[model samples]
Target chain A: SELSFNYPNFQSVEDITFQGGASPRNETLQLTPTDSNGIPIRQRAGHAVYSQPFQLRDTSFYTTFTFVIRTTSNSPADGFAIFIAPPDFPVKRYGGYLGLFEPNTATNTSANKVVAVEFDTWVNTEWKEPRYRHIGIDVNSIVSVRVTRWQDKDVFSRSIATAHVGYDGISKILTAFVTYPDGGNYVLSHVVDLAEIFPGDVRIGFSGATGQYETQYIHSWSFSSTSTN
Target chain B: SELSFNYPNFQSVEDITFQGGASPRNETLQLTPTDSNGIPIRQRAGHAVYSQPFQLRDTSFYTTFTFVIRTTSNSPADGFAIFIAPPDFPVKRYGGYLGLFEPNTATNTSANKVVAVEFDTWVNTEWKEPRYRHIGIDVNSIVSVRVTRWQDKDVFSRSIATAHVGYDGISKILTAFVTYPDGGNYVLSHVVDLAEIFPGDVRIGFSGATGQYETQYIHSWSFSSTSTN
Candidate 1:
């Protein structure tokens, strides 16, 4: 079994092969444009995913990406999320959903076998947010397992990428790695069995959305992964 | 630790390092130029090497690249070599040698611990013309382990690149992969005990040279690698 993918320039739209509104415009990837479909310009929302599923066995893995999430107003712009889901997951629900998760409700079923890192902006008091910018790890639920809150920062901080390279045979404590700038790095780990969360395999992908007031852009993104088993 | 590297574009010279006559004159990685050091235009001759070495040991790995080897005159145009050699190896000699291999003589001693896939063009009687364009796997010497000869073909045949991914413990075979074009792909490989060729570890690189009258170009190249151990 093997897998490795990278989209540094998105030389062509087909190169990145995205669904929904995700496309490469002006050399960089536009995850959520100021105007998406009939949605208001600043109300952009979209989800882009990998072309295949990532199967987990009795083995380990690693993956990385470099991207940007920019804004217009000081009202803390909208942010994005990096996730792992089934290959056939849908790209739905705009607004505060970030095209993936949803606030607990009847008409909306939470995405299953999903694991993600959300860069949450535009926090709402009704839904209970940090009242500031922050990042978090979500398991089967949108509720974060762990989070680090902060204010607006650099594309470098926005450059945080994901990697899961090793796991003990039975620890159920797998650590995920992320990096920004040249030397800045961090990790978000969960103390639960991934095999339990995922009935089988998974896929790697990202989704971006914006609040109705400010502008947001994803300059570019690059991902490289390898499955050695 | 895990690492992922992808060069979708050569925004600057420092982005992708090279030595000898090789330079990113047009972001296309001119491994060989139209001329060199006062040489006539189109009389390109040069070679380039990446800065780091690739280690092959207990674990498996995979890497891929997309590059173009263009020429001005079809009449015995020059060619390139995708190789795995010591990072310190020098790029010397021009013409049919392709800046890496040698003819039937000792004065130009071929390198050691070298495993190369040469896209041989400029088939001259003096160089014992292969009669047409061909690709070969060279071990510790320029003598090919196996060669596939073709002529007047697309760069897909000349699209040179190298990669190592997994090994059947019993077959003792380590396969290398190559590709070109956007939303496009390709690959070529050989069989051999990697350790048998390199006393230790080696680097992945390429070298190109032009015949007396032909021109050569490496339109663009993108490589992705992961070292797993």
Candidate 2:
């Protein structure tokens, strides 16, 4: 049986619009197609990827997708991520802190009630070794594994990674395999659980930031999935 | 008695010229009259300040003269100074590690034999605080007080104080005071040696430097002294 959900409607993907003002403080948040080098790109603000709601009888299944993003600023605060959250969550007003996640809270927490596979680039107080950048996965509000520590280098390196998942109570696990293409493109991967990640719907997309410093652009991003009911 | 010495006569004043191009060198030394700015400037390449040979018969009647100098440089390593030494030392080729005082192992132990007051602004390993900024007094052959602490805020203040003696044991002391005056006046004053510092020949003059960094000008210099018999 072929399986698919009405996207653009059920998927609910929206770019965070730039809020314009005068001073740098007033400058609106931006989602640019070009980086500092003026290259075309697409970056996520708030959205998600998940199996469409069919009926309560639908058994759990695995979902897989990939994204590519580049850091634009030198600041330790700029960031981006891939989130799997409930569809009901407001796309524009993620409504926690700064509309990114919840303020003073981690992304995959009980309050957020969502699972996230975040490719964090900035140092956050929640994680140890906050100075060096990294990537992490959250399950049912619990951070399962952090990928940032494993792939260490400067900003110019193509630090890309992919995540694959399977959903059985015992088999429900998400795995991330990273590759550094330009710097010899070495690959590394890890796995974890899903129910431990979220209890409700799952939304997946990208989010980026340019705090005190700004980024030039995003290189590219694409996501495709095969579903089984 | 009128005191007099022939200019350009190295033999009469024990002329010591700090010539350039010597390892651990001292370069062109000469003095110039005060410019419109009132600061006694040193001639480019070198500076010289000398006194006629006089007998220090009574320690009770000595005189002291003081002067201020400014060093301009594209590179901070360029410098200049005020020195007092015996008139018998060779005016040229008396070069040493610091230029003002030769720091050879053989001459290191000779204290009180050659007294020199140096305002050095360069870092040399042999000289402490090798960054090329500081004031120092070398009595005999030992560095007495090396004042490397300088603040730009106090640049125009009376930065230097000196005393000279006229007798073996019972001598009068001369003190020189320097002040950077507003309205473009840099002043140096000579006070009578109320407390005798030395009992013999004292040649006083300015020494300047331009190494790695060069200055455009040295305006002028003028001196007044009490007659010594």
Candidate 3:
């Protein structure tokens, strides 16, 4: 397995391409740091796009990451989402939609393919139901095929164990092991063939947003899985 | 003189290093940002070390850079400096010393043969005269052989053109060119053979510090020289 990043004592994120207002901090890779002015009380968001593209097939691949979401207000609007954005994905737009979907897009069909898992903290009032705080496995749109409450914080926060999000080869399922506060782990599994959703190469990265106030720290992120056939 | 960096649009500073509280910005290579808690109002300072080492054995070699010194308070606690640091330099120390010099040392010799140009903003009260905000050519100590009040700003700022610091080849003099507010340029030349001061190879990079208040932007930087013996 070839890992893209493994957290060097001092991180050098030069390998990936930064989009929108994304920037890097000392210990953490800041997905969106209060835009350009460092004003937390404003609207600004972005993504960290990997320079290398991954070809998704009906096979085995896993992604593991540790992240932190922060907000100035209790509402904690506009959450974070790990995306499988196609090379021809649209230009990044900020806030709530996770830069993956537009409420009213100019085109009816997607210009590019996008399969994602949104660790959402805000409830969408624009359309649909079953909103607010959940870890959702979504493909092409905001609607989630599999979702579970995102209460990993109560367990993941302390000196518990860091969470691990991976794909089990045998089960052919995407599993997000959200560590428990006390003893073990809470698992969220989504069963689907990624190759069916994305037939070809795809770019992977994370996107988050801020409406009134919010910040997300991608503490560490890396991808590993060798069978790219 | 083999050139390494020319300060391009999307800079990849992996050639050098970043230490302490130092970090880079969006598209530009920012030497010092208000460190990781993302706190603009705190005591934080850092450095960026160029991984490339330069071998200077007399002859003609030059380093050119465009930098900005920021002021938030009446008395800026510290500023920045350019150094010819040897391979085995000591751990970095900060403040008005610029991490290149100490007030007084046990031996008159420098810790590790550092030949530098101090872009000093804060004044040193030790055995010195017209102190503060001057560019001093220091070798082995804070004391400078050739010192000049950094009047580059007076000539370079406004709707004015920016300045560049470099070493002129033919004339064999170290010149800091403050391009005129319009188009023409003003040259500050310091005459002295480098071979007389250093007999061998040397490393080059910029170092800066802040105690209570200060910020210096390394807008652009690169080292170039054609005649390398």
Candidate 4:
């Protein structure tokens, strides 16, 4: 069977929070500097604090989140992601949205320490392409060797011109499919099997950040899993 | 001063009446079949019947016509066109839509004898890389000696994967634009100016045909032209 967990709710899932200088979670998390929408806007770069941490005892699982995000800058380095890490991992400001992986810091160098799928919107030095708008699957930390470029491989390959990415995995292998609209909306989806890739207890949560330009928000999120054999 | 003529009601212009395929005058014209939408389909092999002897004394005059056409096959060379010819020209079919320019079977060696601007929809031998999904401007009969590609040059380049070929155009130049929507209505504007290229008594009428794969239709037509220079 399948298991599902809604954002801001789940028994084993705790510390579910939003992080950013301008994230809506600021007010929801009891932070200062509330905006007109009553959500606190962190003036500085930081991770939105979740209510509690959710424990992941198994490896193979599926999670999905839907969020409405608008770009505040032309910079391809401003976006956020979902993280699966150990409970003891210290959350710190990295660099814009990429900071979620601590791209500038060595703290994420631990071997097999973390496995994450970033719904990355901006491209940076790490990714060299004009179509920086993409998603990536990262292992360990920001520097982990196993990284897949989801956007360029699928979205740009289509004959039409636009940006959209999607993926499907049958059994244990994953395949990505994309469609571009000359002028229309786009949807991107990713599927990853954690149990097949790593061995250890995992913590599930959300993280985001901002830089010289602000305005980043998460509309919603959900995680689901089934008991492993 | 400018001379103008309106169809069906203009006294300055003469009207030609037809009884089915027979004409009271020696000049008679025949329409092939109706498309799925009930519009008459032009004969596919490129045979067009001119209304007879109109002289364009000045090169700066404008000719405007409203037409409705649709594709019958995936092949590029299935659409038709309207042509202006000399009084003694014979009728012959050339290559699909391009065949519409086959002026008088006797003079295969005549050069610049007739100037034609074809509102072609099919892919002919002249279509390059992106395939046959647009209209072409054929001047002086020879494909290369004249400008073959002149529609919306910026958007519909040789590299475009597919062409939408809708209607809508403005200004004193001939332009073409494409729109692609998988399951929705696609409509566009198409416009052209003959004064920009050939200056002569321009013939105005519809010519189209269907093939084994599909049938075509010319829904309606109206031309606004100047009779005196």
Candidate 5:
């Protein structure tokens, strides 16, 4: 099947796996939920992974989504990421770990199998976050190899924001372009060999984490891929 | 009377004026509220201003507070600020305006009488925001005269963060030092004549804004001031 799907709004969760705190809400896929105090629960992880794995070797893929991170509280905790990881990747890590890796194993390449682009809001000093909010590229590790300040309106704002992430298999480059409510745009690109990271197919999905209070919502998403091999 | 007061927790709103969406919740002063959907209401302005005015000219003052911005969602909008403004300063502006200035009057020196240190999460391109998350010094305008990327644990984190903002009247410098959950520190200092900004007494308080979902809370606060003049 060439591997393609689009969701203008997440009215259903048939093809998605809602892990941990993730759930379908108001036509969107909410990656985290709040406690009775109306605050995002503390130390939580969440993910919405596509059920089917797709070929990632020598292949080109483009994914786009509209996401909203609700709340303006001065102390927003962690952020979320779009990820491609082995089907069995653990969803145990939360908080600053961003649901991708366990604390002790965050930087361990031998035990991790993932490539992700993170829209990070919290600064994990140990992880060398560029600042509070940024866009970073990660390969198998939570520590990003490439990062840039999110220059758009503000990831924490109420603006309906959009992002387009695409990979060029031939050039071995991954690019992410995001736009804010004010029309400001931020772009980041990196060159990495995916074949070395993934031996075969991988699940594509969104992962998010929260330390205390907040919610990550994906209103819409679309993905398409083709292999030149 | 010497101006000195400490609130370990809001527990009471006696000496505070909570304008707009601001209110007391769970022993904290919540500067904004969410709708029935649990989403922070959009385009809202909130303030927790002290009712008593304190001497400003030739005065040394120190103010500290414990705040939590709870939410890890990537799209945190606007941010809160510690402000010293004329008692009559308008509280009408919201969002990027930070509840301190209106759109057309943001840069109007003659009409604006305020000095503020902002912990901002959203970037207002037109206002010359440094980035999505930053600490900025503003004088009667939304545009910051000095700024530094918040290097502490991200302001949006769940950490019960603390900030100390003080002014040395003799040097005419204002300094703000903040600590995050991980014990990282970010400090900013700027020299400005408060006497020139305020003709007499001024109010010291906190102001915050939200363009979408989010809340700004003050867990504790203390203020003390004395005039060396």
Candidate 6:
């Protein structure tokens, strides 16, 4: 039951477990590396998982993070997610997969023991996403059970965005509150039991992928949970 | 992550954590003690909690139990619940509370961090229950968000009744299946997140209360869970 950490700025990867091509640069956790001209390349995927797992059931928790997404085109390739999954979860490196699921296993119930909130930029008809930008609450599958629209201007503006995810143990409700660079805010929620989906210990983190040249970065992050028995 | 147990017959109170006036009698776990006429006394309340807590998030699990209800009159009093609550939860002794909440705290958000499936025999208008016998899915509050009706003959017939509760981690769905001695069967379900309602590892158990001379007994119980990471 002892798990709590904070990272005002990721000057280094001291408290994070990197997966795929994730790293730290310029005081931010970079999910994908950058090239010359400060732009990222295509077909990139990355994740930064938390180092410890807390007792998820009956525990109330909240997390806050600041993120920046920079893309090479008007339409972003993939997207990113703040997720909790089994420690052995895979990092899928595909444009439409959001680095969260393999193409073949996206709909496989047994393979996807994940609860996530995705900030999607690309609309993949194969995955049934809403047109334009949207935020989703995902359980196990990459497809979200609940979603709210996000305007394109605020999402691809290459500016910093803030996100807060909170779970209320008393009401069994999970809510995602986001504030965009342009002062636009959006909220999304889903009712789920994390303990039912996850077997044991899990890793919480951010994951991102690019179809074209896109990049995702976590400028700062902090999390806290109360397991009062 | 290793928590599993079975009780083919209560015969004794081994492997249980009892609260209030619960005890073992004959081959059953009697929530209220029986008297000379094999009937329980009024205002008796009890609970039987499991001995250990398991990781509930992202782990699918199932439980089975057999129960019996015997009342002193044509109308039954309070009911019983198979519940999951914070380890430090208190056992309310009154009949209407089902030994789950205090008289003034039934609707209080901070005082109720619980998820339960209730087998209700008496209807309390204060809680806004549907008339007739009903089975309900209760979250933090005693008022059920979802309910299904049960015939009077099956619930208070003094015959053995079987129950099975299963939770799917992938779908985040909880389902309760019950069978009566007269071959009546029913299924009730709710899509909820258990991890959202509990602040830490929790205790799982049975709680019962009597307004009049009502009695509740557990004939057998078994539980198993898997925490695959």
How many backbone clashes are present in model 4?
40
Segments in model 6 whose C-alpha atoms lie over 4 Å from true places:
B1-229
Q: How do the residues A38-147 of candidate 2 rate in per-residue lDDT, one tens digit apiece?
A: 43233323332232432111223333333344454444334444455555554432211212454445444556654455444556565343355555555433243433
lDDT of 3 by residue, B1-229 (tens): 4544566432666576776556676554454556465323234446666666655553444445665555556666566677766655533556656766554661255354676666676676754634546766666666665565545344224222244444423333454433333223222345545655566655677777765556666666655544422
Better of 2 and 5 by TM-score: 5
For candidate 6, give the DockQ: 0.02
Flag regions of model 1 displaced more than 4 Å. Answer: A36-40, A105-111, A155-178, A182-185, A213-229, B1-229
- After best superposition, candidate 4 residue B225: deviation in angstroms? 48
Instruction: Write down the lDDT that model 5 would get.
Output: 0.77
Candidate 5 displacement at residue B204 in angstroms: 50
Across residues A108-218, which tens digit of lDDT does each residue of candidate 6 receive? 667778888998888888877787788888887877887767677777777899876766454455766576643455545557777666647777999888776678889
Instruction: Give the least accurate 10-residue stretch of model 3 chain B, judged by summed lDDT.
Output: B179-188
Worst 10 residues of 1 chain A by lDDT: A162-171
Roughly what TM-score does model 3 have, to 2 decimal places? Answer: 0.44
Pairs of residues clashing in candidate 1: A34-A41, A54-A202, B34-B42, B61-B165
lDDT of 1 by residue, B199-223 (tens): 5656767787776444344543433
The sequence of per-residue lDDT tens digits that candidate 4 reaches over residues B1-229 is 1333334222222453221221121122322444466443444443434354354442223333333333333443354445545544444453353444443421332454444444444455543312434344444452422122223331222221122111111122222112121111111122334443334544544444444333322222233223222
Predictions ranked by lDDT, top down?
A: 5, 6, 3, 1, 4, 2
Q: What TM-score applies to chain A of candidate 6?
A: 0.94
Q: Which residue pairs of candidate 3 clash? A: A155-A181, B15-B51, B16-B50, B16-B51, B17-B49
User: Could you give the TM-score of chain B for each candidate, in order?
Assistant: 0.73, 0.50, 0.76, 0.50, 0.94, 0.94
lDDT of 6 by residue, B98-210 (tens): 99888787977677788889988888888678888898888888888777677777876678998767665555667665766434455555677776665368888999888
In order of appearance, the predictions have TM-scores of 0.44, 0.33, 0.44, 0.35, 0.49, 0.51
Q: Count the backbone clashes (under 3 Å) in each candidate.
A: 4, 73, 5, 40, 22, 23
lDDT of 1 at B71: 47
